[PDB]
């Protein structure tokens with residue numbers, strides 16, 4: 001959840017917002033180790049429920065999200081249903097555990113390609129055009145993350161937009177991402193320069209992946 | 212419906228058969244002028260019912276078809292339901308009136324392209340990949356006709372097969388068609404040659420389109 005003024009400005013200027021719970025357990029092995037564990041359900045529930053209690057009156061918020069990159073656990077299903085029960089007015093989405101689990105109203109993959117399948121075991125990233133028409137599938141597809149804009153990038157961005165415009169159920173996506181996470185440091189002359197992972201003696205680090 | 216021996220050979224050699232009622236009204240304006248008219252229901256019904264009564268025991272027949280290129284009329288709906296009621300063991304398909312009407316279990320377009328939409332009014336031919344995932348659509352797609360093999364043709368055939376293999380619900384199609392409808396005529400030297408529309412003084416004719 002963002003600084004409270006963010007939603008005020010989104011209401012007044014006009015942006016659709018996905019409001020997302022402060023839950024990410026990416027570094028767990030497997031990714032759902034905590035989110036499938038009932039012991040972690042109370043802590044998780046508060047991150048979801050207190051977000052909804054705070055932001056439910058903002059018109060800019062059109063979708064709730066259960067968080068980011070935490071696999072798919074039973075705790076996700078429980079909290080998905082909590083929101084659906086408490087606030088029928090907004091769909092709930094969540095990408096973890098394959099982007100099309102029982103905890104999401106929207107197929108919301110990250111970095112699924114337009115035409116190319118990536119058939120990873122358990123959590124494949126189907127071509128977005130193919131994903132829509134899989135046997136039994138009926139949901140809309142909106143990438144929670146696509147077009148990783150890291151450095152000299154956004155090659156093949158036009159390919160997404162062509163597909164979005166042609167297929168009714170391909171309803172767009174959220175680019176990753178808005179702003180480089182570089183920090184200002186100062187050299188011997190007091191001149192400012194942009195720094196990234198590792199430039200603060202921080203180790204282990206992931207270098208320029210913050211940009 | 213074919214010569215009776217055809218089904219016997221398909222049973223024994225092993226080919227899947229679509230058995231099709233002898234109903235085509237292509238030259239009507241509009242195409243459903245007769246098929247939507249209750250006066251023509253009796254004649255149409257016998258073309259359907261007597262086919263089913265003849266061929267229902269052949270294992271090679273897996274799909275019934277209501278005919279060809281006769282638009283979509285209420286008579287098709289009636290006869291669709293008739294077959295479904297009499298023989299639940301085989302799907303019913305029919306392409307007329309846009310290939311995805313209430314008279315078909317299978318989306319069965321003719322010459323719909325792989326990636327290219329052709330948004331004709333009333334009867335659009337969507338790209339087959341796009342067709343599958345139109346809002347609400349759940350049926351399999353098998354082209355009743357595709358890859359028109361007229362003369363030097365089958366350009367782009369590989370594009371179809373790549374899509375068939377990638378998308379579970381694209382379950383193939385029937386090439387148009389098997390054999391040139393050329394006829395033998397004889398010249399002065401008694402030599403046989405291959406003749407097409409117009410070569411018998413037949414007029415109006417559609418020239419080489421029989422091949």
Ligand SMILES: CC(C)S[C@@H]1O[C@H](CO)[C@H](O)[C@H](O)[C@H]1O
Pocket residue numbers: 110145209210
């Ligand atoms: C396969 C890994 C690089 S995960 C990848 O890292 C990205 C780095 O910018 C983002 O954080 C994405 O959300 C994450 O999926």
Ligand SMILES: CC(C)S[C@@H]1O[C@H](CO)[C@H](O)[C@H](O)[C@H]1O
Pocket residue numbers: 321356420421
């Ligand atoms: C627009 C017309 C060419 S219709 C077209 O003609 C073809 C010619 O072989 C086939 O008969 C197809 O079934 C028919 O749709």
Ligand code: NA
Pocket residue numbers: 163164165166167168169170171172
């Ligand atoms: Na769209």
Ligand code: NA
Pocket residue numbers: 209210211
């Ligand atoms: Na990053």
Ligand code: NA
Pocket residue numbers: 374375376377378379380381382383
């Ligand atoms: Na297929």
Ligand code: NA
Pocket residue numbers: 420421422
């Ligand atoms: Na022809």
